[PDB]
Amino acid sequence: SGIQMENSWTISKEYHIDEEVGFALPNPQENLPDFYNDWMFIAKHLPDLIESGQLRERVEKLNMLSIDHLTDHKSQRLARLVLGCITMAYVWGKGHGDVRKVLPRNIAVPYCQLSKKLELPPILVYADCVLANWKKKDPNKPLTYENMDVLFSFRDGDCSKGFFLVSLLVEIAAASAIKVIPTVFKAMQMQERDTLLKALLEIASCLEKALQVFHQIHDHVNPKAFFSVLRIYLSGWKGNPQLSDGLVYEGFWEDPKEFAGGSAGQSSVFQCFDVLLGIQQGHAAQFLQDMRRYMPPAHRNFLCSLESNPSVREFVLSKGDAGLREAYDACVKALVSLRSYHLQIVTKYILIPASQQDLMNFLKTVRSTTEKSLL
Numbered sequence: 001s002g003i004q005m006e007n008s009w010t011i012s013k014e015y016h017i018d019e020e021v022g023f024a025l026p027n028p029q030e031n032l033p034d035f036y037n038d039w040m041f042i043a044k045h046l047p048d049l050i051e052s053g054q055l056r057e058r059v060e061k062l063n064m065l066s067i068d069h070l071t072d073h074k075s076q077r078l079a080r081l082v083l084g085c086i087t088m089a090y091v092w093g094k095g096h097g098d099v100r101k102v103l104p105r106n107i108a109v110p111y112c113q114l115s116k117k118l119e120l121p122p123i124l125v126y127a128d129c130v131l132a133n134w135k136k137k138d139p140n141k142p143l144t145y146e147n148m149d150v151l152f153s154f155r156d157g158d159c160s161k162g163f164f165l166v167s168l169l170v171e172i173a174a175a176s177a178i179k180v181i182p183t184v185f186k187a188m189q190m191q192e193r194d195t196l197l198k199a200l201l202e203i204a205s206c207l208e209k210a211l212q213v214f215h216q217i218h219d220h221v222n223p224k225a226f227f228s229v230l231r232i233y234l235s236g237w238k239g240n241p242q243l244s245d246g247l248v249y250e251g252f253w254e255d256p257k258e259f260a261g262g263s264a265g266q267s268s269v270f271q272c273f274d275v276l277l278g279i280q281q282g283h284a285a286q287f288l289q290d291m292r293r294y295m296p297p298a299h300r301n302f303l304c305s306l307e308s309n310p311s312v313r314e315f316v317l318s319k320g321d322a323g324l325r326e327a328y329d330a331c332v333k334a335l336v337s338l339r340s341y342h343l344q345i346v347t348k349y350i351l352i353p354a355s356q357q358d359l360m361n362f363l364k365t366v367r368s369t370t371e372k373s374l375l
């Protein structure tokens with residue numbers, strides 16, 4: 001039947017989409033129960049521990065901590081972020097090729113149990129290091145770069161604050177577009193021309209603003225630092241020649257298991273508005289559907305219910321209504337500009353620095369598909 005609704009105005013809370021921060025976690029927990037203090041210390045001290053060569057031995061001396069004291073969603077998500085960062089640090093070390101193929105059981109077991117409860121793979125994903133990895137400095141001030149911080153970083157100078165928070169702020173900007181989605185579908189059922197037009201224009205304007213928030217990335221991230229340092233800890237063990245069979249989660253699985261590292265495909269924004277605008281469109285469709293299984297399951301169910309709703313695109317073009325066509329086209333254009341900027345960032349922060357020590361084709365093809373969706 002499509003999107004489930006909490007009331008006449010707001011989508012169901014089962015989708016875990018917040019009115020203010022959207023797909024991001026609202027007011028994330030910063031501290032775990034005292035019981036997990038040893039976990040919190042390691043995660044808070046990851047930069048000096050990796051730098052000093054101490055991280056692995058500190059992890060190796062942790063006791064087994066049960067997850068039963070992680071009683072609510074926010075604490076489980078904080079715990080996943082803490083254990084996820086520790087796992088990446090333990091596996092990659094200093095990033096120079098001295099990798100660990102076995103995650104010690106005292107981390108692997110609670111991490112794998114927690115991940116099973118949340119239906120997330122046992123590797124760091126976007127939902128951890130961006131969507132749950134933030135705080136306000138001043139609770140009474142707004143959600144701005146200057147008034148926020150990340151909870152955890154990997155190395156001093158890795159630009160993880162700039163990379164993660166700017167990404168979060170784009171997610172927060174998109175939240176103003178996401179909350180309009182129910183009005184779009186109500187307007188269509190009611191045949192309310194103006195309500196639909198203004199909904200589409202507000203979506204377009206919020207996506208335009210989200211693109212302006214994205215532009216801040218250059219002011220808080222250094223390309224060399226990103227490519228040579230942060231990217232190490234976002235790397236996974238699926239098709240990776242350094243862990244060709246995967247990672248052994250000691251005490252959970254006998255055999256090694258492959259899980260993919262971070263991908264921009266894990267943000268739900270692009271598919272949210274591709275689906276809404278009917279814009280959605282080989283082996284890349286497999287990788288993209290795979291990245292969907294790295295999103296929180298409720299967000300997956302939102303994306304799926306959205307596809308089950310009537311098509312904005314079909315409604316709009318059948319009206320001989322320039323205003324609706326232009327408003328739809330404004331949304332499409334905003335999405336195209338966001339993809340274009342994504343390609344620029346991939347080129348400046350990944351492709352060039354790599355050249356100095358297939359992807360372009362996939363992304364450029366999806367951008368042109370979007371541009372060909374203009375009516």
Ligand SMILES: C#Cc1ccc(NC(=O)CC[C@]23CN(S(=O)(=O)c4ccc(C(C)(C)C(=O)O)cc4)C[C@H]2C[C@H]2C[C@@H]3C2(C)C)cc1
Nearest residue numbers: 124125126167170171234262263264265266267269342345
């Ligand atoms: C664990 C984990 C982990 C950590 C971070 C992320 N980040 C995202 O998913 C961000 C999504 C973004 C994309 N940009 S980005 O700067 O172009 C960007 C480019 C490349 C990548 C990586 C390295 C993961 C890759 O793909 O190789 C990540 C981001 C930032 C965001 C802003 C706009 C464009 C979307 C947006 C719509 C919200 C994923 C997994």
